Write a protein that binds this ligand. Structure first.
Ligand code: HEM
Ligand code: HEM
Ligand code: HEM
Ligand code: HEM
Ligand code: NO2
Lengths: 140, 146, 140, 146
């Protein structure tokens, strides 16, 4: 369960990220590919090099999904239904990989929000990404 | 673990800039706040009822400093992590029975603290090199389980 | 999400277990304590030796919780609310330990249900125990 | 991994009774059915659309037999798992990039198959000894990641 304090904290950090969210989504994906190379095999047709247009475009899609999840925080299973189908049924994403991308999304926020990334807010965002991860793996 | 000389370079250049009296307690504090089951092993540290209570707790800072000391120690012995960490593995494994997943967790929280402290400078390649490192320490601390 | 086929499969295996369920719950706990000794520290005031009355009595409580979860499969968060409070807030059970107890509950079923433990039914029970685990760790 | 002589005894007595042409494919089959993301790595095996389709698939049985062969091999080399598994680690890690969590999963599925096949005889102490074993193999198969 996400508490009111957590919903407030995640809405806060979303707000400071503002329009950098697609860029930060791309940066989290590169952090993941460099740090945990096993994840690369899901993107065999992407150029995963730095500055890649395909990594940029995907970053924006991920950040938009997460933004849809924040905006519908009380109804995430329903908002993320089509994407949980996608990742479990078609793509067969290993559940461990959600933890790795969540961790890189947190690193990326920390690297860009000195002020917003306090211990309480880090806790709330961790819980948010774990809830999104739960939804996205709910459909195997 | 084998780091390339470019990985080694990334790690040590950043590490010389780390506040060793602070970063440890920040990483322990955050572990306890973010993964509160870990507060199980720190009942004696006192007031942990709040995030501020944790971060401001003198015992959390005191103990995190020793934790960071142990990390600094593996950074000097990259090719001998098993050796370096034997005694601590015996302690956390045989005496404390901390599940090793938590070692990976504290490693990742430390990475988050470094990113927070260093911003832009904690680049995606620099993170990758630190992940190999905290992976290697977690694994060595868990050897008394393998 | 648990499918109709999964709900049917779990109801099936529950039925064959019949009144051995407390005994099997005790056996799963011993399997866990022997196999994954770290879990023992949550029971510092139990005698964990074989034939222990305290392990027997607890086995029955666990099997009764799981039976309540099967009986209220569409409303597990609500049926298991008090127990998720207990395990996250008071006991501070590490989430990894749910996987270990789930695995031992599966082993115990396999050891006692040659006929019922087919691959489909193993899949359905794994999903059921993972759903119970999700509920029980939802409250940190 | 160090098994006691009583653990060693438990493992080898049961293992001599195992149908090596069958148990491997039963454990691989069940891995694919229970953890279906693992079907990612077996696209070429053909019809995996059903549980029956999996278990009855000749390729699943064929390949699981080799997997069980590798397990039998570590059971003979308990004190040299790192050595025994090097080539397979290189393969699953550097070439296939299977996440190592899945090694722990297949180990646990095998334990479930043994319990199924042996019933009463797969006692809680016998399980404990097999857990040390499949833990040791997973860890050795994952060495090309550490
Ligand atoms: C926070 C978790 C995640 C979110 C919010 C998310 C979001 C998305 C979205 C929105 C798409 C659709 C792209 C499109 O419609 O064109 C997508 C596709 C995809 N996702 Fe994820 N995802 C997540 C986690 C993961 C993980 C962990 C992996 C594997 C490492 C993964 C692999 C993929 C792949 C391979 C595609 C198809 C990409 C393509 O061919 O264009 N996702 N994801
Ligand atoms: C991630 C890597 C970790 C490192 C490098 C580390 C390092 C240390 C060090 C250097 C000490 C003090 C030992 C002494 O006084 O000689 C210690 C003590 C302790 N650590 Fe850790 N630790 C780690 C992870 C953990 C985790 C995750 C937990 C629990 C969540 C934990 C629980 C403890 C406890 C309870 C003590 C005090 C034990 C005692 O002195 O009796 N540690 N650790
Ligand atoms: C399938 C998952 C589980 C179920 C259904 C479950 C069920 C229960 C129930 C029904 C109780 C209440 C006993 C009472 O009211 O007297 C309880 C207490 C407890 N549970 Fe669990 N539990 C589960 C997982 C775990 C795990 C993984 C651990 C830790 C390894 C754990 C540790 C405990 C402890 C320490 C108590 C208090 C025991 C006492 O002092 O009497 N549980 N659990
Ligand atoms: C748990 C321990 C495991 C053992 C002991 C094991 C053993 C083996 C063996 C003996 C082979 C054949 C290698 C050869 O022909 O020389 C192999 C191939 C393979 N394994 Fe595993 N394996 C394990 C886990 C896994 C898991 C969990 C996956 C994926 C979910 C996986 C995917 C593969 C694939 C895709 C191949 C075929 C690769 C090729 O020949 O190009 N394995 N494994
Ligand atoms: O315990 N979550 O994988």
């Amino acid at each position: 369960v996400l508490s009111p304090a957590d919903k407030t904290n995640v809405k806060a950090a979303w707000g400071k990220v503002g329009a950098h969210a697609g860029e930060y989504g791309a940066e989290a994906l590169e952090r993941m590919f460099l740090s945990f190379p096993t994840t690369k095999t899901y993107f065999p047709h992407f150029d995963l090099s730095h500055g890649s247009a395909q990594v940029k475009g995907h970053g924006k899609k991920v950040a938009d999904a997460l933004t849809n999840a924040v905006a519908h925080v009380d109804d995430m299973p329903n908002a993320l239904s089509a994407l949980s189908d996608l990742h479990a049924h078609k793509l067969r994403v290993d559940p461990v990989n959600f933890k790795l991308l969540s961790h890189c999304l947190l690193v990326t926020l920390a690297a860009h929000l000195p002020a917003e990334f306090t211990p309480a807010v880090h806790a709330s965002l961790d819980k948010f990404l774990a809830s999104v991860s739960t939804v996205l793996t709910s459909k195997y | 673990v084998h780091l390339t000389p470019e990985e080694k370079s990334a790690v040590t250049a950043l590490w010389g800039k780390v506040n060793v009296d602070e970063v440890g307690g920040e990483a322990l504090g955050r572990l306890l706040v973010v993964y509160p089951w870990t507060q199980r092993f720190f009942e004696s540290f006192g007031d942990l009822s709040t995030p501020d209570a944790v971060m401001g707790n003198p015992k959390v800072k005191a103990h995190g400093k020793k934790v960071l000391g142990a990390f600094s120690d593996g950074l000097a012995h990259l090719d001998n992590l098993k050796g370096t960490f034997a005694t601590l593995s015996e302690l956390h494994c045989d005496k404390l029975h901390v599940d090793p997943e938590n070692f990976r967790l504290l490693g990742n929280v430390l990475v988050c603290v470094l990113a927070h402290h260093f911003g832009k400078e904690f680049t995606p390649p620099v993170q990758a090199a630190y992940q190999k490192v905290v992976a290697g320490v977690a694994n060595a601390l868990a050897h008394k389980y393998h």
